[PDB]
Structure formats: structure tokens, C-alpha cells
Amino acid sequence: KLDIKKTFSNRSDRVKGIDFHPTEPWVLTTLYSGRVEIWNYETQVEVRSIQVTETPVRAGKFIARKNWIIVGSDDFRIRVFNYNTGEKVVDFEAHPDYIRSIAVHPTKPYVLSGSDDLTVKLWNWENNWALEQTFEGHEHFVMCVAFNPKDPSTFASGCLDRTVKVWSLGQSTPNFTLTTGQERGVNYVDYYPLPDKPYMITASDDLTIKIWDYQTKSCVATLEGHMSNVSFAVFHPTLPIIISGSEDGTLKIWNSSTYKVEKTLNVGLERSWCIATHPTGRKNYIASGFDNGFTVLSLG
């Protein structure tokens, strides 16, 4: 049963990236102001915060097995900090343009970064953060990168060039390119995490969300309802729902069977930019970042 409860919301400068820690009740936010914050959303106290740079930090993830966060900013740099001490672990120029998205491999010491420089790059932290591969082919800003959780030797990139490309580590060309028909670009791409469907989902400035079968490359459904740019759309890892957020200021919860909207929320923080779901579905927690702060919600 739905029953959405606000577990914790706080105001801040624009939140561009957001992520849950898998074992600690923490959420990381990365802000347009160059600040990043880690909050305990149950006690409502900051565990750690850092003024990383003066430029926007659009991407941030926990690397829990190393006790790190990894962040990427408009100053072209990837930085890694230990969240127990605040100490900076590494600081390098990753791309000659904005970093939009960072993905962390579940079992290997690999991170992917997607950039306005039209590429995705693969970095190996057990090889001194060496650049091990650059994936070329996209023709506009790479807005989102995500590993296939069912096979993380592959990953998807979503791009303003209106395509999603799916790649294999160690190979220079896409396994396939998905022509989305979302003519104003792809802002976000996500995988359905369960084994029963080979699904991906894309979000666009053209106000649509689309579901794809990655075996046949077919569009399964198109979700309409948002009134401004759709910033993200994701499958919930345990509940039969899709969650999206938009510059129209709303989050929408969609039935993942019928593809109909179940609930629209305006949490009152203006434009929505980013989303996270708790890795193990603890308390069905989700979190989203907005122009004016973030909110952590329990869905039921």
C-alpha cells in the first residue's frame, strides 16, 4: 500500500546529484554551489560536508566498500574524499568540459564518467586512477551513465544526441545504439534491476518517458504527464512502480504494469533534478534533489 511519508527534507542550494549509502542511514547531496553534504536522514544531523569547489558539482556517488564519495564538477575535475575523515583521496582533471554523471562498478574498481566532451571515460582506482578506456561515438553531451546491474560488463549512456548507447567494457564501439525518438535529447537512462524483464527507461526534454526492451530494441510504452523537462525516470528496485521528476516541480509515481500515473507530488522545492532509491529498499526510501533542497521519502 502506498502511503508516502516525508522522513526528512532540508533546504539548500540547488541539488544536482543525490545517492543513498547502502548500510548507513545516509544520503549524499551534491550542490550547484560546489558544496556536498552527507546527511543522516533518521537523526537529521550532518555527518560530513565539504566545500569541494566553486563550480557546480553535478555528480556524486558513495563507494561504500572503500569508505569514499566520488564527485564530478564543472571545473572538469573528479575528486574522491574519505567520508570518515573528510580527507581528499585523489583530485584529477577527467574531461575538458562539464562532468554530468558518474557510475560505480558493483564489484570491480571501475568508475565511469560522462561528459559534455561527448565521451564516457573509465577510470581504474586499483591502477592509480588511470584512464583505461574512452568511449567515443555520441554527438552531444553525455547526460547519464549507468551499469547494467544484471551484467555490469555492460553499461548505458544517455545523450542529448537523442540516443542511448550500450557498451561493453573493453570494446570501443556500442553493442547497439537506441534511436529513442525523443527529439530534444535523452537526459537520463536507467535499468530495471530484476531478471524478469530486459527493460531500460529514458527521460527527455520532450516531456516524455519511454520504456525499452533491450533485446528487441522496441519501445514498450511512452509515459506522458509531465509539463516541463523530465530530469529523470527510474524503476524502483522492489516496488512495481516507476518514479520520475521534472522541472515542472513534481515527482510522479507510475504503475509499472499499466504505465498509468498513480500519484503526483509537488514537494514545494521548485525544479526537480536528481533521484536515488535505497539499494536494498529499506523502508522503501527514495530521495530527490531540487532547486531549493532535497527530500527523503518513505513510499510505504
Binding site: 562539464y98 559534455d116 553531451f141 547526460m143 542529448l160 537526459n187 525544479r271
Partner: peptide
């Protein structure tokens, strides 16, 4: 630049 915000 697109998506500057």
C-alpha cells in the same frame, strides 16, 4: 550551453 542550470 544547454542544461546549464
Amino acid at each position: 550551453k544547454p542544461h546549464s542550470d
